[PDB]
Design a protein around this ligand. Structure first.
Ligand code: A1AX2
Length: 209
Protein backbone atom coordinates (compact mmCIF):
# COMPACT_ATOMS: atom_id res chain seq x y z
CA UNK A 1 0.00 0.00 0.00
CA UNK A 2 1.94 2.99 -1.39
CA UNK A 3 0.67 6.58 -1.28
CA UNK A 4 1.97 9.06 -3.88
CA UNK A 5 2.01 12.81 -3.17
CA UNK A 6 2.87 15.93 -5.17
CA UNK A 7 5.53 18.25 -3.77
CA UNK A 8 4.32 21.78 -3.15
CA UNK A 9 5.34 23.89 -6.14
CA UNK A 10 7.96 25.85 -4.18
CA UNK A 11 9.69 22.64 -2.99
CA UNK A 12 9.62 21.17 -6.50
CA UNK A 13 11.30 24.37 -7.70
CA UNK A 14 14.02 24.17 -5.03
CA UNK A 15 14.69 20.54 -5.91
CA UNK A 16 14.95 21.30 -9.62
CA UNK A 17 17.36 24.19 -8.90
CA UNK A 18 19.53 21.89 -6.78
CA UNK A 19 19.55 19.25 -9.51
CA UNK A 20 20.13 21.50 -12.54
CA UNK A 21 22.36 24.35 -11.31
CA UNK A 22 26.06 24.01 -12.07
CA UNK A 23 27.68 23.96 -8.61
CA UNK A 24 30.88 22.04 -7.93
CA UNK A 25 30.86 22.14 -4.10
CA UNK A 26 28.63 19.08 -3.74
CA UNK A 27 30.29 17.76 -0.56
CA UNK A 28 28.16 20.06 1.66
CA UNK A 29 25.31 17.53 1.45
CA UNK A 30 26.97 15.47 4.17
CA UNK A 31 27.41 18.45 6.51
CA UNK A 32 23.74 19.28 6.12
CA UNK A 33 22.51 15.74 6.80
CA UNK A 34 24.79 15.34 9.83
CA UNK A 35 23.53 18.70 11.13
CA UNK A 36 19.92 17.51 10.70
CA UNK A 37 20.79 14.33 12.62
CA UNK A 38 22.38 16.35 15.44
CA UNK A 39 19.21 18.48 15.67
CA UNK A 40 17.04 15.33 15.85
CA UNK A 41 19.27 13.93 18.61
CA UNK A 42 19.07 17.20 20.58
CA UNK A 43 15.25 16.97 20.48
CA UNK A 44 14.98 13.46 21.93
CA UNK A 45 17.62 14.34 24.52
CA UNK A 46 15.58 17.36 25.63
CA UNK A 47 12.37 15.32 25.90
CA UNK A 48 14.22 12.68 27.96
CA UNK A 49 15.25 15.29 30.55
CA UNK A 50 11.75 15.31 32.02
CA UNK A 51 10.52 11.88 30.84
CA UNK A 52 13.26 9.20 30.84
CA UNK A 53 10.95 6.60 29.29
CA UNK A 54 11.32 8.48 26.02
CA UNK A 55 14.58 6.53 25.68
CA UNK A 56 12.99 3.10 26.20
CA UNK A 57 13.22 2.81 22.39
CA UNK A 58 17.01 3.18 22.60
CA UNK A 59 19.35 4.91 25.06
CA UNK A 60 22.33 5.50 22.74
CA UNK A 61 22.45 8.84 20.90
CA UNK A 62 24.73 8.58 17.85
CA UNK A 63 25.27 8.96 14.09
CA UNK A 64 26.52 6.19 11.78
CA UNK A 65 27.80 6.64 8.21
CA UNK A 66 27.43 3.44 6.17
CA UNK A 67 28.85 3.30 2.62
CA UNK A 68 27.91 0.33 0.44
CA UNK A 69 29.77 0.12 -2.88
CA UNK A 70 27.78 -2.87 -4.15
CA UNK A 71 24.45 -1.02 -3.73
CA UNK A 72 26.02 2.38 -4.57
CA UNK A 73 24.43 3.85 -1.44
CA UNK A 74 25.57 6.07 1.41
CA UNK A 75 23.34 5.78 4.48
CA UNK A 76 23.28 8.28 7.38
CA UNK A 77 21.66 6.74 10.50
CA UNK A 78 20.79 8.60 13.69
CA UNK A 79 18.92 7.64 16.86
CA UNK A 80 17.19 11.00 17.18
CA UNK A 81 13.54 11.81 17.75
CA UNK A 82 12.44 10.45 14.35
CA UNK A 83 9.42 11.57 12.35
CA UNK A 84 5.71 10.71 12.33
CA UNK A 85 3.87 9.99 9.09
CA UNK A 86 2.36 13.47 9.27
CA UNK A 87 5.88 14.91 9.67
CA UNK A 88 7.11 13.00 6.61
CA UNK A 89 4.29 14.33 4.44
CA UNK A 90 4.79 17.88 5.78
CA UNK A 91 8.20 18.16 4.07
CA UNK A 92 10.07 15.87 6.49
CA UNK A 93 9.30 18.03 9.52
CA UNK A 94 10.58 21.29 7.95
CA UNK A 95 9.02 24.66 7.16
CA UNK A 96 10.17 24.11 3.60
CA UNK A 97 7.78 26.54 1.87
CA UNK A 98 8.81 29.60 3.89
CA UNK A 99 12.40 28.31 4.16
CA UNK A 100 12.66 28.04 0.37
CA UNK A 101 11.34 31.60 0.00
CA UNK A 102 13.82 32.95 2.57
CA UNK A 103 16.69 31.01 0.93
CA UNK A 104 15.88 32.32 -2.53
CA UNK A 105 15.51 35.89 -1.21
CA UNK A 106 18.86 35.50 0.56
CA UNK A 107 20.55 34.42 -2.70
CA UNK A 108 19.22 37.52 -4.42
CA UNK A 109 20.81 39.55 -1.60
CA UNK A 110 24.27 37.96 -1.81
CA UNK A 111 24.28 34.49 -0.22
CA UNK A 112 25.46 31.34 -1.96
CA UNK A 113 24.11 27.84 -2.07
CA UNK A 114 26.22 26.56 0.80
CA UNK A 115 24.11 28.57 3.30
CA UNK A 116 21.07 26.36 2.48
CA UNK A 117 21.10 24.92 6.01
CA UNK A 118 20.44 28.34 7.58
CA UNK A 119 16.97 28.26 6.00
CA UNK A 120 15.86 24.89 7.28
CA UNK A 121 15.90 23.10 3.90
CA UNK A 122 19.35 21.52 4.06
CA UNK A 123 17.85 18.06 3.58
CA UNK A 124 17.23 18.69 -0.11
CA UNK A 125 20.98 19.17 -0.73
CA UNK A 126 20.97 15.35 -0.80
CA UNK A 127 19.96 15.76 -4.47
CA UNK A 128 23.40 17.26 -5.20
CA UNK A 129 24.71 13.67 -5.16
CA UNK A 130 21.71 11.31 -5.11
CA UNK A 131 19.40 10.28 -7.92
CA UNK A 132 16.96 8.80 -5.37
CA UNK A 133 16.63 9.31 -1.61
CA UNK A 134 14.85 6.91 0.79
CA UNK A 135 14.11 8.02 4.37
CA UNK A 136 13.20 5.33 6.95
CA UNK A 137 11.95 6.75 10.24
CA UNK A 138 10.48 5.68 13.58
CA UNK A 139 9.06 8.19 16.10
CA UNK A 140 7.97 7.06 19.60
CA UNK A 141 4.38 8.14 18.80
CA UNK A 142 3.96 6.39 15.40
CA UNK A 143 4.82 3.32 13.28
CA UNK A 144 7.90 2.83 11.06
CA UNK A 145 7.52 4.55 7.67
CA UNK A 146 9.52 4.83 4.42
CA UNK A 147 9.54 8.07 2.37
CA UNK A 148 11.04 8.04 -1.10
CA UNK A 149 11.65 10.44 -4.00
CA UNK A 150 13.57 10.61 -7.26
CA UNK A 151 12.44 14.29 -7.58
CA UNK A 152 10.34 14.78 -10.72
CA UNK A 153 7.61 16.39 -8.62
CA UNK A 154 6.39 13.55 -6.39
CA UNK A 155 7.25 11.41 -3.36
CA UNK A 156 5.85 8.19 -1.87
CA UNK A 157 5.10 7.16 1.68
CA UNK A 158 4.50 3.59 2.82
CA UNK A 159 4.58 1.50 5.98
CA UNK A 160 8.05 0.00 6.28
CA UNK A 161 8.17 -3.77 6.77
CA UNK A 162 11.99 -3.82 6.78
CA UNK A 163 14.44 -4.06 9.67
CA UNK A 164 12.88 -2.47 12.80
CA UNK A 165 14.73 0.68 13.83
CA UNK A 166 13.71 1.31 17.42
CA UNK A 167 13.80 5.12 17.09
CA UNK A 168 15.46 7.54 14.69
CA UNK A 169 15.98 8.24 11.02
CA UNK A 170 17.92 6.57 8.20
CA UNK A 171 18.66 8.61 5.05
CA UNK A 172 19.66 6.29 2.17
CA UNK A 173 21.39 8.16 -0.69
CA UNK A 174 21.24 6.23 -3.98
CA UNK A 175 24.25 7.96 -5.51
CA UNK A 176 24.53 9.25 -9.05
CA UNK A 177 26.93 7.27 -11.21
CA UNK A 178 29.58 10.02 -11.21
CA UNK A 179 29.38 10.72 -7.46
CA UNK A 180 30.86 7.50 -6.06
CA UNK A 181 33.80 9.31 -4.41
CA UNK A 182 31.40 9.74 -1.45
CA UNK A 183 31.66 5.99 -0.82
CA UNK A 184 35.44 6.05 -0.30
CA UNK A 185 36.57 6.02 3.32
CA UNK A 186 39.28 8.66 2.91
CA UNK A 187 36.86 11.09 1.19
CA UNK A 188 34.15 10.70 3.85
CA UNK A 189 36.70 11.17 6.67
CA UNK A 190 38.03 14.33 4.99
CA UNK A 191 34.54 15.83 4.74
CA UNK A 192 33.58 14.98 8.32
CA UNK A 193 36.80 16.52 9.63
CA UNK A 194 36.37 19.64 7.47
CA UNK A 195 32.69 20.39 8.18
CA UNK A 196 31.45 18.32 11.15
CA UNK A 197 34.42 18.01 13.50
CA UNK A 198 32.63 19.57 16.51
CA UNK A 199 29.25 17.72 16.35
CA UNK A 200 28.39 16.70 19.91
CA UNK A 201 27.47 13.08 19.16
CA UNK A 202 29.76 10.20 18.11
CA UNK A 203 30.01 9.79 14.32
CA UNK A 204 31.13 6.29 13.32
CA UNK A 205 32.25 5.68 9.75
CA UNK A 206 31.66 2.01 8.95
CA UNK A 207 34.16 0.16 6.74
CA UNK A 208 33.46 -2.45 4.08
CA UNK A 209 34.75 -5.98 3.42
C1 A1AX2 B 1 22.42 24.27 -6.25
C2 A1AX2 B 1 21.61 25.11 -6.11
C3 A1AX2 B 1 20.62 26.14 -5.95
C4 A1AX2 B 1 19.75 26.14 -4.85
C5 A1AX2 B 1 18.82 27.16 -4.71
C6 A1AX2 B 1 18.73 28.18 -5.65
C7 A1AX2 B 1 19.60 28.19 -6.74
N1 A1AX2 B 1 19.53 29.19 -7.74
C8 A1AX2 B 1 20.49 30.05 -8.18
C9 A1AX2 B 1 21.76 30.09 -7.36
O1 A1AX2 B 1 20.38 30.70 -9.21
C10 A1AX2 B 1 20.52 27.16 -6.89
Amino acid sequence: EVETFAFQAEIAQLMSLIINTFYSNKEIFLRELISNSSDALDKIRYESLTDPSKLDSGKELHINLIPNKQDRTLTIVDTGIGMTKADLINNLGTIAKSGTKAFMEALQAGADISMIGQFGVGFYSAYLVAEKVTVITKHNDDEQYAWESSAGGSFTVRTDTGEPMGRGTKVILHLKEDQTEYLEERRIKEIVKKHSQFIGYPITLFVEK
